[PDB]
């Protein structure tokens, strides 16, 4: 959720990165990942859900 | 089709004596001078991977040529890294040249193992459950390589494992080995120690997930 | 279809590409390469009122 | 099926050059290395021919190359002549290697003319009919020949002319052209400089007329 002045926009990308040798740290290494695009003036609430992902039937 | 190159067969090689593949494995080092080449890099920007396999061998041999070689797909080994847990190098590949028979082998008695620390006294190491047994490797999928009829290798074994499937960079449950079942002995003037050859393709993959090229930890 | 002095019927903004992510470089592969652009008519297009040459190319 | 060979790629060839083969002239001359046997003699003995053409080429590049060639069938070309109106030699072939691009060609400038004579004041040449425009190349049938995915050239051009024939020793209506689109870069060590081999078939042909061999006037 968002909250901020009136006449102002922008844009945000959300991604989500799997296990690797370290966490991703610049957006081009991201942007290679899942990712969405959530415009600041669309909506205020661009819902996320994480895709469930495993090799197994359950986690610790 | 990856192709890989062996060691040349000689004479001086005792018996029992082998050399393995360890697939998807034996590809992050190009084993054997082998470059996939698509299949190599598609692995890193993935992590969950799930596919068959199918192999072949070759070895000419000559009318005045006599020996025996086993070949045999087994699965869940752990013969492809020394004794303290790391995978050997290519200078020690073209050193040993092949895998001799050992009382440590026979009895899974070196396989990498956790060092307890400074807190406990030292036990005496005495077996391990991922011995080998020289003679009956023949249960397991496997055919024969006489000097007189042996032609090439075949094979298709279908996917194993723990799971539906597992990790790429850590996934190890197929793997091809060879065995020099009688000494080489030949006259000489024919092909003399000829080389062996090896093929591989996987079969029905299915890549998993998206990210950047994998980095060493 | 001639511009003698900028106005909004003639020009209509610009086109430009962007570079989104540094691409890889492979092993021992070479460097620098090469993009060609191309152009063509829409299917719609069509000019209108004809009109007489500059022979300049002659020079 | 007539197959000749054409100079070698190189690094220092700049960008826009060319050379060209113009059928069915360049079989008189064997351009490069290149001997019917039947058709070449057959034409000699006759006057008039109607046929088409289907030509090919090929240049093997490597994983490490990289440039970018442009093939084209340009008809009714007379790039094939010296400015001053006489066929080039086996000795300039050599020499030349390709031909640069230049304002006279791009002009059609320096194409062969008669001299007016002592009569007439002397005229500055300005322009012709033939330039060369080298980026409109691409108009007429063509291919591109990138080091990554250039496999071969094909093109099946049908029969044109003034005229529904015309005589062989003249007649000039199509020819083939080759062109450097990027100059060609590479990592040493793969295939340097890679040859170019290009192979021509007729089709439908109809010769005409029956006489001794064609002498020279």
Redesign the interface.
């Given at each position: 959720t968002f909250c901020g002045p009136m006449m102002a926009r922008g844009k945000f990308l959300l991604s989500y990165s799997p296990p690797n040798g370290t966490q991703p740290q610049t957006l081009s290494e991201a942007m290679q990942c899942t990712y969405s695009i959530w415009d600041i003036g669309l909506n205020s609430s661009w819902t996320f859900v994480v895709p469930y992902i495993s090799p197994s039937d359950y986690r610790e | 089709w990856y192709t890989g190159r062996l060691n040349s067969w000689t004479k001086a090689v005792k018996t029992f004596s082998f050399q393995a593949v360890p697939l998807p494995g034996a590809f992050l080092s190009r084993q054997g001078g082998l470059n996939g080449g698509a299949f190599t890099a598609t692995l890193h920007?993935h992590?969950?991977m799930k596919c068959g396999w199918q192999v072949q061998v070759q070895c000419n041999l000559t009318q005045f040529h006599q020996g025996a070689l086993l070949v045999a797909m087994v699965p869940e080994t752990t013969l492809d890294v020394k004794p303290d847990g790391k995978a050997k190098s290519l200078q020690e590949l073209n050193e040993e040249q092949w895998v001799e028979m050992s009382d440590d082998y026979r009895t899974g008695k070196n396989m990498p193992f956790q060092s307890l620390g400074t807190y406990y006294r030292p036990p005496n190491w005495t077996w391990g459950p991922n011995f080998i047994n020289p003679y009956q490797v023949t249960v397991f999928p496997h055919q024969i390589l006489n000097a007189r009829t042996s032609t090439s290798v075949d094979i298709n074994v279908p996917y194993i494992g723990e799971?539906?499937?597992?990790?790429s960079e850590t996934q190890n449950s197929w793997t091809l080995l060879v065995m020099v079942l009688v000494p080489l002995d030949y006259k000489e003037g024919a092909t003399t120690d000829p080389e062996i050859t090896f093929s591989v393709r996987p079969t029905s993959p299915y890549f998993?997930?998206?990210?950047?090229?994998?980095?060493?930890? | 279809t001639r511009a003698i002095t900028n106005s909004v019927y003639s020009a209509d903004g610009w086109f430009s590409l962007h570079k989104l992510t540094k691409i890889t470089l492979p092993p021992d592969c070479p460097q620098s390469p090469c993009i060609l652009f191309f152009a063509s008519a829409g299917e719609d297009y069509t000019l209108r009122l004809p009109v007489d040459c500059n022979p300049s190319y002659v020079f």
């Open positions: - | 920007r992590f969950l799971t539906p499937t597992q990790s998993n997930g998206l990210r950047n090229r994998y980095t060493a930890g | -």
